């Protein structure tokens, strides 16, 4: 995890995913390992505000691949 | 209910030796026999034991299965603790790879009508070497299903595609009229220890001393051999100094290497004398009059 | 005798182990008895195939025992049809040691093969000895005046494999058989096994003599006759003639070892010369 | 994930046009669920439903289970959403689907089966087919 | 014993048939302890069947026999057998467990383990004593019971 | 940072021992 803890679903999901060698449907366990990469702003009402964070780096270095 | 590619055929240690012995003795006749065992599940076929059908006559091909021989052998095997059904048939392919011919396909269809999971095992006793037996398990692909655009089997795993099909088998109808089932071997501690007794020398041989007259003559002859090899070894050292790196090996073709033979003579002589000396020393105290 | 050596193939061992396992599964069995099939070559037997036969014995009485000899004939015709060169050469039983009724069973076996050979194949994996112990029935004519009886005479046994049979065995022993050990190490392990085998044989004699001393068994007078020859054959290694000859012979082999080691070291130096030349040449161009 | 679902459906279509085996067919289904994991967008499956119908036997089990991967975190409604995707009872080859639906239901609530366990415990108990027992 | 318990109360004691029983000592002795024993008359072999309610789980049995050699050595265990079982159907059939007892297990301070996986839902248990620790024509059993839990 | 360097070196030495022991084990099995 981001704080250094061993993410239990990520570890289990990857292992059962590697069991796709013996069972193809077991590959869906990799969805457990998928940790979303997000920054979610919240308020005292636990709602999401319209906050625009600033990334002090070039847009292209961390960006989606250009569609074909 | 399509059969799974991850299906495995388990051949016991006893079964493998019987087909190898029967197949080799029947070279080059495609000697056939029946495989006894049990369909454990949809993914496992165990071959506990096999027995060989007799050859009706001359001809290098698989003959028809003799029903009287099969039934009364199966009946009589049930008396001695073998109530195992027929899970397929085995036959030999003496040297030309493991595949199924036109006659083999017809023979397998006879088993497929009775048992839908019957397995055709082909054993190559000629191409089989120590540590690697050329074997393969086949089951027929139905023409009706594959022609319409259906795979013969479902692939839910990686297990069935670990062995790359041989070109000889692919030529003779593999993946077209029949498919290969991966073969795993069931070996236990008991049978494995029993086979370890092969070539196990008697305890008498270990303490037995070689004849000293022949041992000295062998000592004499081999040392005399190094006398000439050493003389040739000196020439080999000077020759290779003034000699181009393209002929480092081409010039060694067809001419004996004194260095290689000197090592072999040294290695042979070192084990011959050390063992004889140690055996003599051990026998000095082990067999003592006091 | 009529048999000089019995060669038992690995197929027989696997068949006997499987035979003991399958019948032993349904019911606890003291032993299982089958028929040994093989060919004859000079005076060495070549036991190569075997089949199971129905058999049962009451533990209380050795006299009560049943062997399905009609099954024995029926199964022979099966194996003769497949392999005509394999004839009945004896029988086997998995009992750890001989039984009193074995001489009786051999007579039933003797009518199919006059020189029947009983091979005791121990299913239990003994650590030192071979699992097979071949015996033949002979007439022991006693010199004490006791009437001649039928006794089993031991015949040396060896496990040998056919070329194709050996191929399968190495496939099954591929992982566990360690062939990396050199020839010199193998012979020394044979010498260690020879010491262990001799020690076990000597303890068996000592155990027998211990029981004889306390009266558990009476004096055989053939073992004691044999034992005096064994101790009489024990050489005196303290004789001056033997010691000088041993020293003379040992020094003869040492110089050959010295010569071989002397040749080995310089040949090793030649290899080091080539390695340094190859290393120096490789770095010069790069 | 749904708002920022900048998936590239051109890549998926490019490899679908190249499938000639069931192995590559089921691979795209797992691939499709991977790029749409948590995005709750089954646009690829909707458009190529007739191509998704080529999946047979355990491929249907994998294909049905891909729905749970796509709808991971959709706790708000999953019973109705799966029942929307899957009819209650079907005779021909529904064990792979019915078992796949239970497995997909587990994928939605992976590590969060607060109230889905009781349903899955009951469906597993009142199940006769082995494939459904596998998915359950 | 660790959350499980002895199960003679579950044993109905009415569907229990001990074939090869002896009139001298009956099946009641080995199910109640309080010294005494069960023994056979016709032969060393001794077939025992035990019945109870269908929900019962077996973990271990304590077939403690005497020390002279009349205690069981090789025993066969069968579960849920429709129809009756003669001595041949207990000798020519495949048991669930065929544990070969040692002298340590026979000791009254001894408990033998069973393969708990294969003993989950038991309607009745058939026990076939095939041999004893010796050649005593009668086989004796000092005490016996099943340690486990209901299903 | 002295202790971090000392412990990082300590784990590197212990890891090297693991690597050299497995490389000796593999050479034994590579000959087979
Ligand atoms: Zn053929």
UniProtKB/Swiss-Prot annotation, chain A:
Highest taxon listed in the record's lineage: Eukaryota
Residue runs in coiled coils: none
Described function: Component of the 26S proteasome, a multiprotein complex involved in the ATP-dependent degradation of ubiquitinated proteins. This complex plays a key role in the maintenance of protein homeostasis by removing misfolded or damaged proteins, which could impair cellular functions, and by removing proteins whose functions are no longer required. Therefore, the proteasome participates in numerous cellular processes, including cell cycle progression, apoptosis, or DNA damage repair.
Family: Belongs to the proteasome subunit S1 family.
Oligomeric form and interacting partners: Component of the 19S proteasome regulatory particle complex. The 26S proteasome consists of a 20S core particle (CP) and two 19S regulatory subunits (RP). The regulatory particle is made of a lid composed of 9 subunits, a base containing 6 ATPases and few additional components including PSMD1. Interacts with ADRM1. Interacts with ZFAND1.
Protein name: 26S proteasome non-ATPase regulatory subunit 1
UniProtKB/Swiss-Prot annotation, chain C:
Keyword GTP-binding in record: no
Chain positions of cross-link Glycyl lysine isopeptide (Lys-Gly) (interchain with G-Cter in ubiquitin): 177
Modified residues annotated as N6-acetyllysine in this record: 201, 211
Domain of life: Eukaryota
Stretches assigned to the MPN domain: 6-141
Entries under Gene3D superfamilies matching the protein: Cytidine Deaminase, domain 2
Quaternary structure (record): Component of the 19S proteasome regulatory particle complex. The 26S proteasome consists of a 20S core particle (CP) and two 19S regulatory subunits (RP). The regulatory particle is made of a lid composed of 9 subunits including PSMD7, a base containing 6 ATPases and few additional components. Within the complex, PSMD7 interacts with subunit PSMD4 through their respective MPN domain. Interacts with TRIM5.
Task of the protein: Component of the 26S proteasome, a multiprotein complex involved in the ATP-dependent degradation of ubiquitinated proteins. This complex plays a key role in the maintenance of protein homeostasis by removing misfolded or damaged proteins, which could impair cellular functions, and by removing proteins whose functions are no longer required. Therefore, the proteasome participates in numerous cellular processes, including cell cycle progression, apoptosis, or DNA damage repair.
Miscellaneous information on this protein: Does not bind a metal ion.
Protein's recorded name: 26S proteasome non-ATPase regulatory subunit 7
Phylogenetic lineage: Eukaryota, Metazoa, Chordata, Craniata, Vertebrata
From Swiss-Prot, chain D:
Segments annotated as PC repeats: 62-95, 100-133
Signal peptide bounds: none
Transmembrane domains' residue ranges: none
Function: Component of the 26S proteasome, a multiprotein complex involved in the ATP-dependent degradation of ubiquitinated proteins. This complex plays a key role in the maintenance of protein homeostasis by removing misfolded or damaged proteins, which could impair cellular functions, and by removing proteins whose functions are no longer required. Therefore, the proteasome participates in numerous cellular processes, including cell cycle progression, apoptosis, or DNA damage repair.
Homology family: Belongs to the proteasome subunit S1 family.
Subunit structure: Component of the 19S proteasome regulatory particle complex. The 26S proteasome consists of a 20S core particle (CP) and two 19S regulatory subunits (RP). The regulatory particle is made of a lid composed of 9 subunits, a base containing 6 ATPases and few additional components including PSMD1. Interacts with ADRM1. Interacts with ZFAND1.
This protein's name: 26S proteasome non-ATPase regulatory subunit 1
Originating species: Homo sapiens
UniProtKB/Swiss-Prot annotation, chain E:
PITH domain segment(s): 1-151
Protein species of origin: Homo sapiens (Human)
Residues of the full protein shown: 120 to 270 of 289
Protein name (record): Thioredoxin-like protein 1
A GO CC annotation given for this chain: cytoplasm
Tissue distribution of the protein: Ubiquitous.
Subcellular location: Cytoplasm; Nucleus
Taxonomic lineage: Eukaryota, Metazoa, Chordata, Craniata, Vertebrata
GO molecular function, one term: protein-disulfide reductase activity
Swiss-Prot/TrEMBL keywords: Cytoplasm, Disulfide bond, Electron transport, Nucleus, Phosphoprotein, Proteasome, Redox-active center, Transport
Keyword Membrane (UniProt): no
Primary role: Active thioredoxin with a redox potential of about -250 mV.
Primary location class: cytoplasm
Keyword tRNA-binding: no
Assembly behavior: Component of the 19S regulatory cap of the 26S proteasome. Interacts with PSMD14/RPN11. Interacts with, and reduces EEF1A1.
